[PDB]
Design an enzyme around this catalytic site. Structure first.
Site, PDB file in Angstrom:
ATOM      1  CB  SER A 134      -2.810   5.654   1.218  1.00  0.00           C
ATOM      2  OG  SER A 134      -2.222   4.400   1.483  1.00  0.00           O
ATOM      3  CG  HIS A 142      -0.460   3.854   5.987  1.00  0.00           C
ATOM      4  ND1 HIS A 142       0.569   4.576   5.425  1.00  0.00           N
ATOM      5  CD2 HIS A 142      -1.273   3.496   4.967  1.00  0.00           C
ATOM      6  CE1 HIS A 142       0.386   4.654   4.118  1.00  0.00           C
ATOM      7  NE2 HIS A 142      -0.725   4.006   3.814  1.00  0.00           N
ATOM      8  CD  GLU A 150       3.431   6.136   7.470  1.00  0.00           C
ATOM      9  OE1 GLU A 150       2.511   5.876   6.666  1.00  0.00           O
ATOM     10  OE2 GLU A 150       4.152   7.150   7.355  1.00  0.00           O
ATOM     11  CG  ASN A 161       2.201   7.178   0.836  1.00  0.00           C
ATOM     12  OD1 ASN A 161       3.001   6.494   0.197  1.00  0.00           O
ATOM     13  ND2 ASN A 161       1.106   6.670   1.388  1.00  0.00           N
TER      14      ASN A 161
HETATM   15  N1  LIG Z   1      -2.244  -0.654  -2.712  1.00  0.00           N
HETATM   16  C1  LIG Z   1      -1.368  -0.180  -1.809  1.00  0.00           C
HETATM   17  O1  LIG Z   1      -0.161  -0.311  -2.068  1.00  0.00           O
HETATM   18  C2  LIG Z   1      -1.729   0.442  -0.515  1.00  0.00           C
HETATM   19  C3  LIG Z   1      -3.171   0.643  -0.189  1.00  0.00           C
HETATM   20  N2  LIG Z   1      -3.577   1.191   1.047  1.00  0.00           N
HETATM   21  C4  LIG Z   1      -4.976   1.487   1.386  1.00  0.00           C
HETATM   22  O2  LIG Z   1      -5.577   0.309   1.828  1.00  0.00           O
HETATM   23  C5  LIG Z   1      -6.935   0.135   1.358  1.00  0.00           C
HETATM   24  C6  LIG Z   1      -6.737  -1.195   0.677  1.00  0.00           C
HETATM   25  O3  LIG Z   1      -6.487  -1.045  -0.725  1.00  0.00           O
HETATM   26  P1  LIG Z   1      -6.020  -2.309  -1.564  1.00  0.00           P
HETATM   27  O4  LIG Z   1      -5.787  -3.596  -0.851  1.00  0.00           O
HETATM   28  O5  LIG Z   1      -4.937  -1.891  -2.472  1.00  0.00           O
HETATM   29  O6  LIG Z   1      -7.284  -2.575  -2.567  1.00  0.00           O
HETATM   30  P2  LIG Z   1      -8.000  -3.826  -3.145  1.00  0.00           P
HETATM   31  O7  LIG Z   1      -9.023  -3.365  -4.103  1.00  0.00           O
HETATM   32  O8  LIG Z   1      -7.014  -4.766  -3.730  1.00  0.00           O
HETATM   33  O9  LIG Z   1      -8.751  -4.494  -1.886  1.00  0.00           O
HETATM   34  C7  LIG Z   1      -9.955  -3.934  -1.297  1.00  0.00           C
HETATM   35  C8  LIG Z   1     -10.938  -5.035  -0.939  1.00  0.00           C
HETATM   36  O10 LIG Z   1     -12.044  -4.332  -0.311  1.00  0.00           O
HETATM   37  C9  LIG Z   1     -13.222  -5.018  -0.582  1.00  0.00           C
HETATM   38  N3  LIG Z   1     -14.364  -4.174  -0.217  1.00  0.00           N
HETATM   39  C10 LIG Z   1     -14.868  -3.061  -0.823  1.00  0.00           C
HETATM   40  N4  LIG Z   1     -15.952  -2.550  -0.230  1.00  0.00           N
HETATM   41  C11 LIG Z   1     -16.163  -3.395   0.847  1.00  0.00           C
HETATM   42  C12 LIG Z   1     -17.114  -3.464   1.890  1.00  0.00           C
HETATM   43  N5  LIG Z   1     -18.120  -2.636   2.074  1.00  0.00           N
HETATM   44  N6  LIG Z   1     -17.027  -4.454   2.825  1.00  0.00           N
HETATM   45  C13 LIG Z   1     -16.000  -5.360   2.709  1.00  0.00           C
HETATM   46  N7  LIG Z   1     -15.072  -5.396   1.778  1.00  0.00           N
HETATM   47  C14 LIG Z   1     -15.193  -4.397   0.876  1.00  0.00           C
HETATM   48  C15 LIG Z   1     -13.073  -5.372  -2.046  1.00  0.00           C
HETATM   49  O11 LIG Z   1     -13.998  -6.389  -2.495  1.00  0.00           O
HETATM   50  C16 LIG Z   1     -11.590  -5.779  -2.119  1.00  0.00           C
HETATM   51  O12 LIG Z   1     -11.358  -7.191  -2.005  1.00  0.00           O
HETATM   52  C17 LIG Z   1      -7.234   1.441   0.622  1.00  0.00           C
HETATM   53  O13 LIG Z   1      -7.895   2.348   1.520  1.00  0.00           O
HETATM   54  C18 LIG Z   1      -5.849   1.983   0.250  1.00  0.00           C
HETATM   55  O14 LIG Z   1      -5.799   3.407   0.068  1.00  0.00           O
HETATM   56  C19 LIG Z   1      -2.604   1.484   2.057  1.00  0.00           C
HETATM   57  C20 LIG Z   1      -1.306   1.290   1.859  1.00  0.00           C
HETATM   58  C21 LIG Z   1      -0.739   0.771   0.580  1.00  0.00           C
END
Ligand SMILES: NC(=O)C1=CN([C@@H]2O[C@H](COP(=O)(O)OP(=O)(O)OC[C@H]3O[C@@H](n4cnc5c(N)ncnc54)[C@H](O)[C@@H]3O)[C@@H](O)[C@H]2O)C=CC1
Ligand SMILES: NC(=O)C1=CN([C@@H]2O[C@H](COP(=O)(O)OP(=O)(O)OC[C@H]3O[C@@H](n4cnc5c(N)ncnc54)[C@H](O)[C@@H]3O)[C@@H](O)[C@H]2O)C=CC1
Lengths: 291, 293
Positions: free
Chosen positions: B126, B147, B159, B197
């Site tokens: 994001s 996205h 997106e 966003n």
């Molecule tokens: N939370 C939201 O509403 C939104 C988040 N995003 C983006 O999406 C991504 C996902 O964030 P979320 O799901 O919220 O976070 P989250 O923390 O809930 O999930 C991330 C997952 O990545 C894993 N992870 C971390 N390093 C890793 C690696 N080297 N190899 C494999 N897995 C790894 C973690 O263990 C975790 O399960 C971020 O880049 C965020 O900016 C995009 C749109 C909406």
């Protein structure tokens, strides 16, 4: 405090007529004021048509009642071309005339001299400091803003604007009136845009700039905000809906007031469209083409 | 045109789990990846519960039909702790891991070596520049942003972010993939905040500023935007719903990149709540307090 019962609505336009309609429908005595008998005749004809369109749906099973409800409501609205002769004993003046400060102040300056003592003065202005109008009178404690939303008989929100001089008694009286209209009043200070436009307009401008920047198409931007943020209309659809000239007017107002803020920076696209009289749906063409 | 049939979703958190769920439910072979088997076991469990929840609401008239549906979807979701082990035969990699540029670049720099020639890389980030991440590889023509929005299984928008290097073929293939997922793709350049966003967040910040300034209450502002603009949620309810930390993070980034810009000036109230670890519905408290589930 005072209980508003007799209301004087000055200006029978889109907003004025809507305000007069809801007040009368909610059991208030109303006097609609405008400039000519013809304008008034048209304003009241519009109110009636609107009341009937509704009644036909709600009193389908009993059309007699429907007609009565309509008649009773229309009969509760009086018309006049002279505000001075009407405010002698009215409880509230709600002004919705041309969005011009000079005209507005003159109107209130004059009415302050004929209005009863308990009378409350309120403006439905969008881009004007409520205070810049109250000072045209010596009734600042009974002066406030009562901002409605189109279509008035539909939109339940009303912004009750209290200036640093507005009485608490006056405020509560407007809050009680708003609820009696079946509306849901919210409070805000006399700051530009109050709540809704202050947060909506600059966002609409931001949407245009994103487009002008060539970062995405208008279609995708609208789709994005509808599906991504759950909005009823995309920014461009909404812009054409509220009028491009109307928006430009409000933004320029904030631009002059503060030419430094990046949110109020003029838009070539917006200006061009308005220039070539393409104001949106109310012209059949704005950012999009209608009808 | 190679049609995406096998997808590798990296990150089993809130976003990745949903992406995996939707891809799996629309006939795509999926491999969900995360650091450990526990994290994975739990992610897939959350996907099951999410599926069983929709099933018991779509197949009320035939619970067995629902069971079949759920089982079929869940089975097309394999799990692995090292994506390098499966990207040699995947058509698309969708990354949704920690929002950290270095961690993401490292990830993609390594996968670039195992991925099939045709494999496309996409980040669900994001706040980071898709270009920054793409240049961690030598596959920029096959790199882009994809996205999504939470909850992924529900939000129809996606997106598709094209960098100056993304190829027309890569773009189109992601567009087709989006529709295959049942989503509605929109296009945007690789600019900060893309579309949503970029227009939403600054608005939420203005909301906070209007409140902090004391021009109106949070409650009245929410009411006003819901009834006046027709929004599903007032700005403060939305802030708590998306995460105050998530929001603050995105804004610090923009402020950092352009500190003189007024739109990104930090918010005392926002920082304080975040500092007090009050992140919204997540922690049972944000601008409003919520009933600890
Ligand atoms: N939370 C939201 O509403 C939104 C988040 N995003 C983006 O999406 C991504 C996902 O964030 P979320 O799901 O919220 O976070 P989250 O923390 O809930 O999930 C991330 C997952 O990545 C894993 N992870 C971390 N390093 C890793 C690696 N080297 N190899 C494999 N897995 C790894 C973690 O263990 C975790 O399960 C971020 O880049 C965020 O900016 C995009 C749109 C909406
Ligand atoms: N257009 C909109 O959707 C909204 C506009 N407003 C505000 O409400 C006011 C009303 O605008 P609209 O109804 O849309 O405009 P309108 O032009 O449709 O109606 C204004 C009416 O005022 C009359 N008028 C003008 N000067 C007058 C005077 N000195 N004495 C008596 N009548 C006079 C006109 O003949 C006209 O019928 C403005 O102050 C505007 O900023 C507020 C909220 C929404």
């Amino acid at each position: 405090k005072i209980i508003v019962k007799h209301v004087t609505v000055i200006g029978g336009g889109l907003m004025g007529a809507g305000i007069a309609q809801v007040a009368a429908a909610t059991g208030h005595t109303v006097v609609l004021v405008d400039q000519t008998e013809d304008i008034l005749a048209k304003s009241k004809k519009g109110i009636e048509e609107s009341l009937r369109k509704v009644a036909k749906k709600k009193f389908a099973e009993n059309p007699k009642a429907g007609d009565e409800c309509v008649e009773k409501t229309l009969s509760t609205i009086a018309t006049s071309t002279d505000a001075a002769s009407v405010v002698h004993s009215t409880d509230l003046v709600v002004e919705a005339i041309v969005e011009n400060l000079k005209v507005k102040n003159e109107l209130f300056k004059r009415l302050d001299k004929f209005a009863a003592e308990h009378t409350i003065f309120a403006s439905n202005t969008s881009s004007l400091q409520i205070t810049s109008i109250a000072n045209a009178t010596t009734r600042q404690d009974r002066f406030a803003g009562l901002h409605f939303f189109n279509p008035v008989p539909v939109m339940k929100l009303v912004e009750v604007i209290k200036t640093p001089m507005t009485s608490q008694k006056t405020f509560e009286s407007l809050v009680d009136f708003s609820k009696a209209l079946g509306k849901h009043p919210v409070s805000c200070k006399d700051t530009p845009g109050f709540i809704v436009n202050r947060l909506l307009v600059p966002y609409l401008m931001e949407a245009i700039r994103l487009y002008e920047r060539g970062d995405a198409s208008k279609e995708d931007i609208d789709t994005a905000m509808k599906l991504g943020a759950g909005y009823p209309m995309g920014p461009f659809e909404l812009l054409d809906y509220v009028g491009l000239d109307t928006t430009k007017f409000i933004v320029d107002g904030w631009h002059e007031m503060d030419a430094e803020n990046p949110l109020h920076q003029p838009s070539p696209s917006l200006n061009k469209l308005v220039a070539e009289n393409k104001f949106g749906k109310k012209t059949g063409e704005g950012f999009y083409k209608y009808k």
